[PDB]
Amino acid sequence: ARGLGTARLQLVEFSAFVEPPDAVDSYQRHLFVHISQHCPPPLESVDVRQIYDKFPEKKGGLRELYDRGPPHAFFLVKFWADLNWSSGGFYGVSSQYESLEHMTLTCSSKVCSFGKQVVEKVETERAQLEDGRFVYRLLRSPMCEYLVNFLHKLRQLPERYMMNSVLENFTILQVVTNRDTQELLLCTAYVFEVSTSERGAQHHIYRLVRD
């Protein structure tokens, strides 16, 4: 793999953002995190066993997911989030995938704290046939309230190193499956640090492997 995806399903763009109330007047959004793969060296690898404890146990945990396979569909994304941006704006998440196959997708996003699942969001999205390939658009999903509240608290911490200590215990697991066949298509584990404002958001993608 040279990016986040397989031959069956590719991530095109992913982002989490806030538009301030003013946006109606002069548009603007702040990206907390953001992946853009609008384009065509193999990724680095990380053994999945090192991150087992950072995600839930039993059904829906990394070990049982990896065991069910397929192994090539598992990725780890490290985000340096930009928490420099404010009261009543719109907080949103947007995702877009592509495949050659027409499918109906189920996307499950699990927020975990100290490796225990804290909240879950499950969504389905049917293929739209555009330009020989199929596109899946989950755009402008309102950010769930736990996460907006978490962000507002985090941003007020007096020191970056304490934000990093707190974020050390906060992870997100995304499982995309073929809603009709139950086949897993993509599983992405996210881990987080804060960036330094002068540096906006950045990320690094790894393949999750298993010796």
81, 107, 173, 208: which one contacts ligand MYR (CB under 6 A)? 81
**Which is it for the CA torsion 126, 75, 168, 29, positive or negative?**
negative
66, 80, 134, 192: which one contacts ligand MYR (CB under 6 A)? 192
Strand partners of residue 128: 135
9, 18, 112, 172: which one contacts ligand MYR (CB under 6 A)? 172
Contacts (CB under 6 A) with ligand MYR, residues 39-58 = none
Q: Is 65 in the site for ligand MYR (CB under 6 A)?
A: no
Is 21 in a helix, a strand, or coil? helix
Q: Is 148 in the site for ligand MYR (CB under 6 A)?
A: no
Exposed/middle/buried for 199, CB within 10 Å: 0-12, 13-18, 19+?
exposed
Complex with ligand MYR: residue 48 or 143, whichever CB lies closer = 143
Tokens of 100: 């050659």
190, 195, 206, 207: which one contacts ligand MYR (CB under 6 A)? 190
Only one of the segments 19-27, 48-56, 63-71, 144-152 lies at the binding site for ligand MYR (rule: CB under 6 A); that segment is 144-152
CB of 191 closer than 8 Å to CB of 208: no
Q: Is 189 in the site for ligand MYR (CB under 6 A)?
A: no
Q: Which helix (H) or strand (E) holds 146?
A: helix 145-155
For residues 35 and 2, give the distance between their C-alpha atoms in angstroms, rounded to a whole number: 14
Only one of the segments 43-51, 53-61, 66-74, 143-151 lies at the binding site for ligand MYR (rule: CB under 6 A); that segment is 143-151
For residues 7 and 110, give the distance between their C-alpha atoms in angstroms, rounded to a whole number: 24
CB of 3 vs ligand MYR, minimal distance in Å: 18
Q: Among residues 157, 137, 3, which one has the least CA distance to residue 83? A: 157
Contact set with ligand MYR (CB under 6 A): 16, 32-33, 81, 93, 109, 111, 121, 143-144, 147, 151, 172, 190, 192
